[PDB]
Amino acid sequence: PPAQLSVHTVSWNSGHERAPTNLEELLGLNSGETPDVIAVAVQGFGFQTDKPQQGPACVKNFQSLLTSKGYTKLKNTITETMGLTVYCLEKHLDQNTLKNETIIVTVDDQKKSGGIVTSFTIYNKRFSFTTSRMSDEDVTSTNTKYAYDTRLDYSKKDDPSDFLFWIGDLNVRVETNATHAKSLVDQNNIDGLMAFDQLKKAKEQKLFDGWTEPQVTFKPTYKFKPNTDEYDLSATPSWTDRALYKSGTGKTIQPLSYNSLTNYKQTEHRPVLAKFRVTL
């Protein structure tokens, strides 16, 4: 029963783009780290129907890399617009107690918005990983555009989880004009631009209640002209891929690092990688 465990998360609003070749960078394994748990969330269009047939290649490439490192895939779940995969080092697993469960929440009739929660237990501590997706236009349970639903929040339960992570595009944007956002970016005034970011506004409205984002030090991860580092100012620069954490039982969770991966340049959005240490 280790005192601490490490967790890496990634999310990428990747659209139609296919898993890049350099998965080690994407997962934060390129400096020799061996985290205990890894979660990968993606948002896009048509994963389920899998018309480009990227499905088989995804499995093969992720499985090859991670199985050699001693990971077991607990669950992969895909909808039309979301994917969530969770991996755990096989050595931590006990079949009797693992209680591996996943739910999908569909909030419209087109099954396009909502979320996924995958949860499991190790050392009698329960982990939950959520991703979610909301479009600007939908009628929602919160009467906001934000990709929060109480059904996806396992801190609210009578049997709440110990360690929870929410990764993806929360549909939180920077609420200022493009000119002024670009100006703040050019000055590297990240906190100044974050003053316009909607996460704090969603929290004021008691959404994402008790959920913490690690300090953001990196520039907005959208919208880029593909294969450049230049913003396309047809959209106001925004942080579209986020990692939040909390415990539902007062456990300590410590962010180790939180960064966009600016080398993945082929799409309009940059993926975001977070690293954590949890105390059981």
Ligand code: HEM
């Ligand atoms: C860079 C973007 C993407 C990332 C990071 C990603 C990640 C993943 C991961 C981690 C898995 C499970 C791997 C495993 O089994 O260990 C998976 C499976 C899958 N993905 Fe993605 N994926 C991406 C793009 C796509 C796209 C564009 C499509 C199709 C439009 C797609 C369709 C599928 C399908 C069908 C599966 C499950 C296949 C099976 O279980 O037989 N993915 N993806």
